[PDB]
GROMACS .gro file of N, CA and C in nm:
model
  462
    1UNK      N    1   1.394  -0.816   0.885
    1UNK     CA    2   1.279  -0.859   0.807
    1UNK      C    3   1.196  -0.740   0.760
    2UNK      N    4   1.136  -0.754   0.642
    2UNK     CA    5   1.054  -0.648   0.585
    2UNK      C    6   0.919  -0.702   0.539
    3UNK      N    7   0.814  -0.624   0.563
    3UNK     CA    8   0.679  -0.669   0.532
    3UNK      C    9   0.601  -0.568   0.449
    4UNK      N   10   0.545  -0.616   0.338
    4UNK     CA   11   0.466  -0.532   0.249
    4UNK      C   12   0.321  -0.579   0.245
    5UNK      N   13   0.228  -0.483   0.245
    5UNK     CA   14   0.086  -0.515   0.234
    5UNK      C   15   0.034  -0.478   0.096
    6UNK      N   16  -0.011  -0.578   0.021
    6UNK     CA   17  -0.070  -0.555  -0.111
    6UNK      C   18  -0.222  -0.549  -0.100
    7UNK      N   19  -0.279  -0.434  -0.133
    7UNK     CA   20  -0.424  -0.417  -0.129
    7UNK      C   21  -0.481  -0.416  -0.270
    8UNK      N   22  -0.560  -0.518  -0.301
    8UNK     CA   23  -0.620  -0.531  -0.433
    8UNK      C   24  -0.734  -0.631  -0.433
    9UNK      N   25  -0.825  -0.616  -0.529
    9UNK     CA   26  -0.944  -0.701  -0.535
    9UNK      C   27  -0.922  -0.822  -0.625
   10UNK      N   28  -0.812  -0.822  -0.700
   10UNK     CA   29  -0.778  -0.933  -0.787
   10UNK      C   30  -0.676  -1.025  -0.719
   11UNK      N   31  -0.725  -1.136  -0.665
   11UNK     CA   32  -0.643  -1.230  -0.590
   11UNK      C   33  -0.529  -1.287  -0.674
   12UNK      N   34  -0.558  -1.313  -0.802
   12UNK     CA   35  -0.461  -1.374  -0.892
   12UNK      C   36  -0.341  -1.283  -0.918
   13UNK      N   37  -0.369  -1.157  -0.951
   13UNK     CA   38  -0.263  -1.061  -0.982
   13UNK      C   39  -0.176  -1.030  -0.861
   14UNK      N   40  -0.237  -1.025  -0.743
   14UNK     CA   41  -0.164  -0.999  -0.620
   14UNK      C   42  -0.065  -1.111  -0.590
   15UNK      N   43  -0.112  -1.235  -0.600
   15UNK     CA   44  -0.028  -1.351  -0.571
   15UNK      C   45   0.087  -1.363  -0.670
   16UNK      N   46   0.061  -1.331  -0.796
   16UNK     CA   47   0.165  -1.331  -0.898
   16UNK      C   48   0.268  -1.223  -0.868
   17UNK      N   49   0.221  -1.108  -0.821
   17UNK     CA   50   0.310  -0.999  -0.782
   17UNK      C   51   0.387  -1.037  -0.656
   18UNK      N   52   0.318  -1.100  -0.561
   18UNK     CA   53   0.380  -1.146  -0.437
   18UNK      C   54   0.490  -1.247  -0.466
   19UNK      N   55   0.464  -1.337  -0.560
   19UNK     CA   56   0.562  -1.437  -0.600
   19UNK      C   57   0.685  -1.372  -0.662
   20UNK      N   58   0.662  -1.276  -0.751
   20UNK     CA   59   0.771  -1.208  -0.821
   20UNK      C   60   0.864  -1.135  -0.724
   21UNK      N   61   0.806  -1.078  -0.618
   21UNK     CA   62   0.885  -1.010  -0.516
   21UNK      C   63   0.965  -1.109  -0.433
   22UNK      N   64   0.904  -1.223  -0.401
   22UNK     CA   65   0.969  -1.325  -0.319
   22UNK      C   66   1.077  -1.399  -0.396
   23UNK      N   67   1.065  -1.402  -0.529
   23UNK     CA   68   1.168  -1.461  -0.614
   23UNK      C   69   1.295  -1.377  -0.607
   24UNK      N   70   1.409  -1.443  -0.629
   24UNK     CA   71   1.540  -1.378  -0.620
   24UNK      C   72   1.555  -1.306  -0.487
   25UNK      N   73   1.576  -1.383  -0.380
   25UNK     CA   74   1.584  -1.328  -0.245
   25UNK      C   75   1.698  -1.228  -0.229
   26UNK      N   76   1.690  -1.148  -0.124
   26UNK     CA   77   1.790  -1.046  -0.096
   26UNK      C   78   1.853  -1.069   0.041
   27UNK      N   79   1.899  -0.960   0.103
   27UNK     CA   80   1.960  -0.968   0.235
   27UNK      C   81   1.854  -0.991   0.342
   28UNK      N   82   1.755  -0.902   0.346
   28UNK     CA   83   1.648  -0.910   0.445
   28UNK      C   84   1.546  -1.016   0.408
   29UNK      N   85   1.475  -1.068   0.508
   29UNK     CA   86   1.367  -1.161   0.483
   29UNK      C   87   1.239  -1.086   0.449
   30UNK      N   88   1.188  -1.109   0.329
   30UNK     CA   89   1.069  -1.039   0.282
   30UNK      C   90   0.942  -1.116   0.315
   31UNK      N   91   0.842  -1.045   0.366
   31UNK     CA   92   0.712  -1.105   0.395
   31UNK      C   93   0.602  -1.028   0.325
   32UNK      N   94   0.508  -1.100   0.264
   32UNK     CA   95   0.401  -1.037   0.189
   32UNK      C   96   0.263  -1.078   0.240
   33UNK      N   97   0.183  -0.980   0.278
   33UNK     CA   98   0.044  -1.005   0.315
   33UNK      C   99  -0.049  -0.946   0.211
   34UNK      N  100  -0.160  -1.014   0.186
   34UNK     CA  101  -0.258  -0.967   0.088
   34UNK      C  102  -0.389  -0.931   0.156
   35UNK      N  103  -0.454  -0.828   0.104
   35UNK     CA  104  -0.583  -0.785   0.156
   35UNK      C  105  -0.674  -0.740   0.043
   36UNK      N  106  -0.799  -0.785   0.047
   36UNK     CA  107  -0.898  -0.743  -0.052
   36UNK      C  108  -0.927  -0.595  -0.037
   37UNK      N  109  -0.940  -0.550   0.087
   37UNK     CA  110  -0.973  -0.410   0.115
   37UNK      C  111  -0.933  -0.369   0.256
   38UNK      N  112  -0.949  -0.240   0.285
   38UNK     CA  113  -0.919  -0.184   0.417
   38UNK      C  114  -1.045  -0.126   0.479
   39UNK      N  115  -1.057  -0.134   0.613
   39UNK     CA  116  -0.958  -0.190   0.705
   39UNK      C  117  -0.964  -0.342   0.712
   40UNK      N  118  -0.863  -0.397   0.775
   40UNK     CA  119  -0.857  -0.536   0.803
   40UNK      C  120  -0.955  -0.561   0.911
   41UNK      N  121  -1.014  -0.685   0.903
   41UNK     CA  122  -1.108  -0.715   1.010
   41UNK      C  123  -1.039  -0.753   1.139
   42UNK      N  124  -0.972  -0.658   1.201
   42UNK     CA  125  -0.929  -0.668   1.339
   42UNK      C  126  -0.866  -0.800   1.373
   43UNK      N  127  -0.794  -0.853   1.276
   43UNK     CA  128  -0.698  -0.957   1.293
   43UNK      C  129  -0.578  -0.870   1.312
   44UNK      N  130  -0.551  -0.792   1.210
   44UNK     CA  131  -0.463  -0.680   1.218
   44UNK      C  132  -0.335  -0.702   1.297
   45UNK      N  133  -0.270  -0.814   1.275
   45UNK     CA  134  -0.154  -0.852   1.350
   45UNK      C  135  -0.029  -0.798   1.286
   46UNK      N  136   0.062  -0.751   1.367
   46UNK     CA  137   0.192  -0.700   1.323
   46UNK      C  138   0.251  -0.778   1.205
   47UNK      N  139   0.331  -0.715   1.120
   47UNK     CA  140   0.373  -0.575   1.130
   47UNK      C  141   0.404  -0.520   0.991
   48UNK      N  142   0.346  -0.406   0.955
   48UNK     CA  143   0.351  -0.359   0.816
   48UNK      C  144   0.449  -0.243   0.792
   49UNK      N  145   0.537  -0.261   0.693
   49UNK     CA  146   0.634  -0.158   0.656
   49UNK      C  147   0.590  -0.076   0.535
   50UNK      N  148   0.505  -0.133   0.451
   50UNK     CA  149   0.466  -0.068   0.327
   50UNK      C  150   0.332  -0.119   0.275
   51UNK      N  151   0.246  -0.027   0.233
   51UNK     CA  152   0.117  -0.062   0.174
   51UNK      C  153   0.112  -0.024   0.027
   52UNK      N  154   0.091  -0.123  -0.059
   52UNK     CA  155   0.079  -0.097  -0.202
   52UNK      C  156  -0.063  -0.124  -0.250
   53UNK      N  157  -0.130  -0.018  -0.296
   53UNK     CA  158  -0.264  -0.031  -0.351
   53UNK      C  159  -0.258  -0.064  -0.499
   54UNK      N  160  -0.294  -0.187  -0.534
   54UNK     CA  161  -0.300  -0.228  -0.673
   54UNK      C  162  -0.437  -0.193  -0.731
   55UNK      N  163  -0.437  -0.108  -0.833
   55UNK     CA  164  -0.562  -0.060  -0.891
   55UNK      C  165  -0.582  -0.111  -1.033
   56UNK      N  166  -0.691  -0.183  -1.055
   56UNK     CA  167  -0.726  -0.233  -1.187
   56UNK      C  168  -0.807  -0.129  -1.264
   57UNK      N  169  -0.747  -0.074  -1.369
   57UNK     CA  170  -0.809   0.036  -1.443
   57UNK      C  171  -0.912  -0.010  -1.545
   58UNK      N  172  -0.949  -0.137  -1.538
   58UNK     CA  173  -1.060  -0.189  -1.618
   58UNK      C  174  -1.179  -0.218  -1.528
   59UNK      N  175  -1.160  -0.198  -1.398
   59UNK     CA  176  -1.264  -0.226  -1.299
   59UNK      C  177  -1.301  -0.102  -1.219
   60UNK      N  178  -1.427  -0.063  -1.227
   60UNK     CA  179  -1.477   0.051  -1.151
   60UNK      C  180  -1.486   0.015  -1.003
   61UNK      N  181  -1.503  -0.114  -0.975
   61UNK     CA  182  -1.507  -0.162  -0.837
   61UNK      C  183  -1.370  -0.151  -0.772
   62UNK      N  184  -1.266  -0.190  -0.845
   62UNK     CA  185  -1.129  -0.178  -0.797
   62UNK      C  186  -1.096  -0.034  -0.763
   63UNK      N  187  -1.147   0.058  -0.845
   63UNK     CA  188  -1.129   0.200  -0.822
   63UNK      C  189  -1.198   0.244  -0.693
   64UNK      N  190  -1.326   0.209  -0.681
   64UNK     CA  191  -1.405   0.245  -0.564
   64UNK      C  192  -1.350   0.182  -0.436
   65UNK      N  193  -1.311   0.055  -0.445
   65UNK     CA  194  -1.256  -0.016  -0.331
   65UNK      C  195  -1.126   0.048  -0.282
   66UNK      N  196  -1.047   0.100  -0.376
   66UNK     CA  197  -0.924   0.170  -0.342
   66UNK      C  198  -0.956   0.303  -0.276
   67UNK      N  199  -1.051   0.377  -0.334
   67UNK     CA  200  -1.095   0.504  -0.279
   67UNK      C  201  -1.140   0.490  -0.134
   68UNK      N  202  -1.224   0.390  -0.109
   68UNK     CA  203  -1.279   0.366   0.024
   68UNK      C  204  -1.173   0.320   0.123
   69UNK      N  205  -1.084   0.232   0.078
   69UNK     CA  206  -0.981   0.176   0.164
   69UNK      C  207  -0.885   0.283   0.217
   70UNK      N  208  -0.859   0.384   0.135
   70UNK     CA  209  -0.767   0.491   0.171
   70UNK      C  210  -0.816   0.572   0.291
   71UNK      N  211  -0.947   0.572   0.314
   71UNK     CA  212  -1.007   0.649   0.422
   71UNK      C  213  -0.977   0.589   0.560
   72UNK      N  214  -0.927   0.466   0.562
   72UNK     CA  215  -0.901   0.396   0.687
   72UNK      C  216  -0.752   0.382   0.714
   73UNK      N  217  -0.672   0.453   0.637
   73UNK     CA  218  -0.527   0.450   0.653
   73UNK      C  219  -0.480   0.571   0.733
   74UNK      N  220  -0.398   0.546   0.835
   74UNK     CA  221  -0.344   0.655   0.916
   74UNK      C  222  -0.253   0.742   0.830
   75UNK      N  223  -0.264   0.874   0.847
   75UNK     CA  224  -0.195   0.970   0.762
   75UNK      C  225  -0.043   0.954   0.767
   76UNK      N  226   0.007   0.889   0.871
   76UNK     CA  227   0.149   0.863   0.886
   76UNK      C  228   0.201   0.769   0.776
   77UNK      N  229   0.113   0.684   0.725
   77UNK     CA  230   0.149   0.589   0.621
   77UNK      C  231   0.176   0.656   0.486
   78UNK      N  232   0.109   0.768   0.461
   78UNK     CA  233   0.120   0.836   0.332
   78UNK      C  234   0.247   0.919   0.320
   79UNK      N  235   0.335   0.909   0.419
   79UNK     CA  236   0.463   0.977   0.414
   79UNK      C  237   0.572   0.886   0.358
   80UNK      N  238   0.534   0.801   0.262
   80UNK     CA  239   0.629   0.716   0.194
   80UNK      C  240   0.605   0.567   0.213
   81UNK      N  241   0.518   0.533   0.308
   81UNK     CA  242   0.490   0.392   0.336
   81UNK      C  243   0.369   0.345   0.256
   82UNK      N  244   0.322   0.430   0.166
   82UNK     CA  245   0.211   0.396   0.077
   82UNK      C  246   0.250   0.422  -0.068
   83UNK      N  247   0.224   0.325  -0.154
   83UNK     CA  248   0.252   0.339  -0.296
   83UNK      C  249   0.135   0.292  -0.381
   84UNK      N  250   0.110   0.361  -0.492
   84UNK     CA  251   0.004   0.322  -0.583
   84UNK      C  252   0.060   0.249  -0.705
   85UNK      N  253  -0.004   0.138  -0.740
   85UNK     CA  254   0.035   0.061  -0.858
   85UNK      C  255  -0.086   0.039  -0.947
   86UNK      N  256  -0.089   0.107  -1.061
   86UNK     CA  257  -0.201   0.098  -1.154
   86UNK      C  258  -0.174  -0.005  -1.263
   87UNK      N  259  -0.274  -0.089  -1.290
   87UNK     CA  260  -0.262  -0.191  -1.393
   87UNK      C  261  -0.365  -0.170  -1.504
   88UNK      N  262  -0.320  -0.180  -1.628
   88UNK     CA  263  -0.409  -0.168  -1.742
   88UNK      C  264  -0.403  -0.032  -1.810
   89UNK      N  265  -0.333   0.062  -1.748
   89UNK     CA  266  -0.324   0.198  -1.801
   89UNK      C  267  -0.251   0.204  -1.935
   90UNK      N  268  -0.166   0.105  -1.960
   90UNK     CA  269  -0.091   0.099  -2.084
   90UNK      C  270  -0.174   0.047  -2.200
   91UNK      N  271  -0.293  -0.003  -2.169
   91UNK     CA  272  -0.383  -0.056  -2.271
   91UNK      C  273  -0.486   0.048  -2.314
   92UNK      N  274  -0.516   0.052  -2.444
   92UNK     CA  275  -0.616   0.143  -2.497
   92UNK      C  276  -0.756   0.103  -2.452
   93UNK      N  277  -0.770  -0.021  -2.406
   93UNK     CA  278  -0.899  -0.074  -2.365
   93UNK      C  279  -0.941  -0.024  -2.227
   94UNK      N  280  -0.849   0.040  -2.156
   94UNK     CA  281  -0.877   0.087  -2.021
   94UNK      C  282  -0.963   0.213  -2.022
   95UNK      N  283  -1.024   0.243  -1.908
   95UNK     CA  284  -1.108   0.361  -1.894
   95UNK      C  285  -1.026   0.482  -1.853
   96UNK      N  286  -1.026   0.585  -1.937
   96UNK     CA  287  -0.948   0.706  -1.913
   96UNK      C  288  -0.997   0.781  -1.789
   97UNK      N  289  -1.125   0.768  -1.759
   97UNK     CA  290  -1.183   0.833  -1.642
   97UNK      C  291  -1.125   0.773  -1.514
   98UNK      N  292  -1.106   0.641  -1.515
   98UNK     CA  293  -1.048   0.572  -1.401
   98UNK      C  294  -0.901   0.609  -1.385
   99UNK      N  295  -0.833   0.626  -1.498
   99UNK     CA  296  -0.692   0.665  -1.498
   99UNK      C  297  -0.674   0.803  -1.435
  100UNK      N  298  -0.758   0.898  -1.476
  100UNK     CA  299  -0.754   1.033  -1.422
  100UNK      C  300  -0.787   1.034  -1.273
  101UNK      N  301  -0.877   0.945  -1.232
  101UNK     CA  302  -0.917   0.935  -1.092
  101UNK      C  303  -0.801   0.884  -1.006
  102UNK      N  304  -0.723   0.792  -1.061
  102UNK     CA  305  -0.608   0.736  -0.990
  102UNK      C  306  -0.494   0.837  -0.979
  103UNK      N  307  -0.470   0.912  -1.086
  103UNK     CA  308  -0.366   1.015  -1.086
  103UNK      C  309  -0.392   1.120  -0.979
  104UNK      N  310  -0.515   1.169  -0.974
  104UNK     CA  311  -0.554   1.267  -0.873
  104UNK      C  312  -0.551   1.206  -0.734
  105UNK      N  313  -0.580   1.076  -0.727
  105UNK     CA  314  -0.580   1.003  -0.601
  105UNK      C  315  -0.440   0.997  -0.542
  106UNK      N  316  -0.342   0.969  -0.628
  106UNK     CA  317  -0.202   0.966  -0.586
  106UNK      C  318  -0.155   1.105  -0.546
  107UNK      N  319  -0.208   1.207  -0.613
  107UNK     CA  320  -0.175   1.345  -0.583
  107UNK      C  321  -0.237   1.390  -0.451
  108UNK      N  322  -0.363   1.352  -0.430
  108UNK     CA  323  -0.436   1.388  -0.309
  108UNK      C  324  -0.366   1.336  -0.183
  109UNK      N  325  -0.318   1.212  -0.191
  109UNK     CA  326  -0.251   1.150  -0.077
  109UNK      C  327  -0.100   1.164  -0.085
  110UNK      N  328  -0.054   1.242  -0.183
  110UNK     CA  329   0.089   1.269  -0.205
  110UNK      C  330   0.175   1.143  -0.199
  111UNK      N  331   0.133   1.040  -0.271
  111UNK     CA  332   0.205   0.914  -0.274
  111UNK      C  333   0.242   0.878  -0.418
  112UNK      N  334   0.355   0.809  -0.436
  112UNK     CA  335   0.401   0.767  -0.569
  112UNK      C  336   0.298   0.685  -0.646
  113UNK      N  337   0.292   0.705  -0.777
  113UNK     CA  338   0.202   0.630  -0.863
  113UNK      C  339   0.281   0.552  -0.968
  114UNK      N  340   0.284   0.420  -0.953
  114UNK     CA  341   0.359   0.335  -1.044
  114UNK      C  342   0.268   0.270  -1.148
  115UNK      N  343   0.324   0.240  -1.264
  115UNK     CA  344   0.250   0.173  -1.370
  115UNK      C  345   0.314   0.040  -1.407
  116UNK      N  346   0.233  -0.065  -1.417
  116UNK     CA  347   0.280  -0.196  -1.459
  116UNK      C  348   0.165  -0.286  -1.500
  117UNK      N  349   0.182  -0.355  -1.613
  117UNK     CA  350   0.086  -0.455  -1.657
  117UNK      C  351   0.122  -0.589  -1.594
  118UNK      N  352   0.055  -0.622  -1.484
  118UNK     CA  353   0.090  -0.741  -1.406
  118UNK      C  354   0.069  -0.872  -1.482
  119UNK      N  355  -0.009  -0.867  -1.589
  119UNK     CA  356  -0.031  -0.985  -1.672
  119UNK      C  357   0.095  -1.020  -1.751
  120UNK      N  358   0.179  -0.919  -1.774
  120UNK     CA  359   0.306  -0.939  -1.843
  120UNK      C  360   0.416  -0.968  -1.742
  121UNK      N  361   0.472  -1.088  -1.748
  121UNK     CA  362   0.568  -1.133  -1.647
  121UNK      C  363   0.699  -1.055  -1.652
  122UNK      N  364   0.745  -1.024  -1.773
  122UNK     CA  365   0.867  -0.948  -1.791
  122UNK      C  366   0.858  -0.810  -1.728
  123UNK      N  367   0.742  -0.747  -1.743
  123UNK     CA  368   0.718  -0.616  -1.683
  123UNK      C  369   0.701  -0.630  -1.532
  124UNK      N  370   0.631  -0.735  -1.491
  124UNK     CA  371   0.602  -0.758  -1.350
  124UNK      C  372   0.728  -0.791  -1.271
  125UNK      N  373   0.821  -0.861  -1.335
  125UNK     CA  374   0.946  -0.900  -1.270
  125UNK      C  375   1.032  -0.777  -1.238
  126UNK      N  376   1.036  -0.682  -1.331
  126UNK     CA  377   1.113  -0.561  -1.312
  126UNK      C  378   1.047  -0.469  -1.209
  127UNK      N  379   0.914  -0.462  -1.214
  127UNK     CA  380   0.838  -0.384  -1.118
  127UNK      C  381   0.854  -0.440  -0.977
  128UNK      N  382   0.857  -0.572  -0.967
  128UNK     CA  383   0.871  -0.639  -0.838
  128UNK      C  384   1.008  -0.613  -0.777
  129UNK      N  385   1.112  -0.613  -0.860
  129UNK     CA  386   1.247  -0.586  -0.813
  129UNK      C  387   1.259  -0.446  -0.756
  130UNK      N  388   1.189  -0.351  -0.818
  130UNK     CA  389   1.187  -0.214  -0.769
  130UNK      C  390   1.109  -0.204  -0.638
  131UNK      N  391   0.996  -0.273  -0.631
  131UNK     CA  392   0.913  -0.273  -0.511
  131UNK      C  393   0.988  -0.330  -0.391
  132UNK      N  394   1.072  -0.430  -0.416
  132UNK     CA  395   1.155  -0.488  -0.311
  132UNK      C  396   1.249  -0.382  -0.254
  133UNK      N  397   1.311  -0.305  -0.343
  133UNK     CA  398   1.402  -0.199  -0.303
  133UNK      C  399   1.329  -0.089  -0.226
  134UNK      N  400   1.206  -0.060  -0.268
  134UNK     CA  401   1.122   0.038  -0.200
  134UNK      C  402   1.086  -0.011  -0.060
  135UNK      N  403   1.059  -0.140  -0.049
  135UNK     CA  404   1.025  -0.202   0.078
  135UNK      C  405   1.141  -0.195   0.177
  136UNK      N  406   1.262  -0.220   0.128
  136UNK     CA  407   1.381  -0.218   0.212
  136UNK      C  408   1.407  -0.078   0.268
  137UNK      N  409   1.375   0.024   0.188
  137UNK     CA  410   1.387   0.162   0.232
  137UNK      C  411   1.283   0.191   0.340
  138UNK      N  412   1.160   0.145   0.317
  138UNK     CA  413   1.051   0.165   0.412
  138UNK      C  414   1.076   0.091   0.543
  139UNK      N  415   1.151  -0.019   0.536
  139UNK     CA  416   1.180  -0.099   0.654
  139UNK      C  417   1.303  -0.048   0.727
  140UNK      N  418   1.367   0.055   0.671
  140UNK     CA  419   1.485   0.114   0.731
  140UNK      C  420   1.607   0.025   0.717
  141UNK      N  421   1.611  -0.052   0.608
  141UNK     CA  422   1.721  -0.144   0.583
  141UNK      C  423   1.823  -0.085   0.487
  142UNK      N  424   1.793   0.035   0.436
  142UNK     CA  425   1.885   0.106   0.349
  142UNK      C  426   1.942   0.226   0.422
  143UNK      N  427   2.067   0.214   0.471
  143UNK     CA  428   2.133   0.318   0.550
  143UNK      C  429   2.145   0.450   0.476
  144UNK      N  430   2.103   0.558   0.540
  144UNK     CA  431   2.111   0.690   0.480
  144UNK      C  432   1.989   0.725   0.397
  145UNK      N  433   1.905   0.625   0.371
  145UNK     CA  434   1.786   0.646   0.289
  145UNK      C  435   1.658   0.609   0.364
  146UNK      N  436   1.572   0.708   0.385
  146UNK     CA  437   1.445   0.686   0.452
  146UNK      C  438   1.330   0.683   0.352
  147UNK      N  439   1.217   0.627   0.392
  147UNK     CA  440   1.100   0.619   0.306
  147UNK      C  441   1.034   0.756   0.290
  148UNK      N  442   1.115   0.857   0.256
  148UNK     CA  443   1.069   0.995   0.245
  148UNK      C  444   1.121   1.055   0.115
  149UNK      N  445   1.232   0.999   0.067
  149UNK     CA  446   1.288   1.038  -0.061
  149UNK      C  447   1.208   0.974  -0.173
  150UNK      N  448   1.119   0.883  -0.134
  150UNK     CA  449   1.042   0.802  -0.228
  150UNK      C  450   0.956   0.883  -0.324
  151UNK      N  451   0.891   0.988  -0.274
  151UNK     CA  452   0.808   1.071  -0.361
  151UNK      C  453   0.894   1.138  -0.467
  152UNK      N  454   1.017   1.173  -0.429
  152UNK     CA  455   1.111   1.234  -0.521
  152UNK      C  456   1.181   1.128  -0.607
  153UNK      N  457   1.213   1.014  -0.546
  153UNK     CA  458   1.281   0.906  -0.617
  153UNK      C  459   1.189   0.834  -0.715
  154UNK      N  460   1.059   0.837  -0.687
  154UNK     CA  461   0.962   0.769  -0.772
  154UNK      C  462   0.869   0.869  -0.841
   0.00000   0.00000   0.00000
């Protein structure tokens, strides 16, 4: 079994992403937990293989909430068990300042930075299929491949 944690302030986009990942099942049993922010309020029950921070580049709050949440993550997670997913960056309507903040944020924590417009299902479906594969690596379900090649692979 493999478990991914989606951290984002937009409940709708997370659930749509969670659905897309759960669609078209694979070998391992996939489990998805959602969180508005970090840390979790000490429910904190097992067991997480991967944390994906979904960042809305039209929301300054989403940016700040992501910034703050990262401070409560153990540094062991940033060795491939953490991935950044930015939404809205492909739109001209987005804030370039927020985009630059996210890029440096992914660099600071040395974690992959993915782009996808979650409102677009076709894009979200392909992104979800990739995230599933990333999760399987993080869960140690891909023989010969550890969640360490991820920074290079992504």
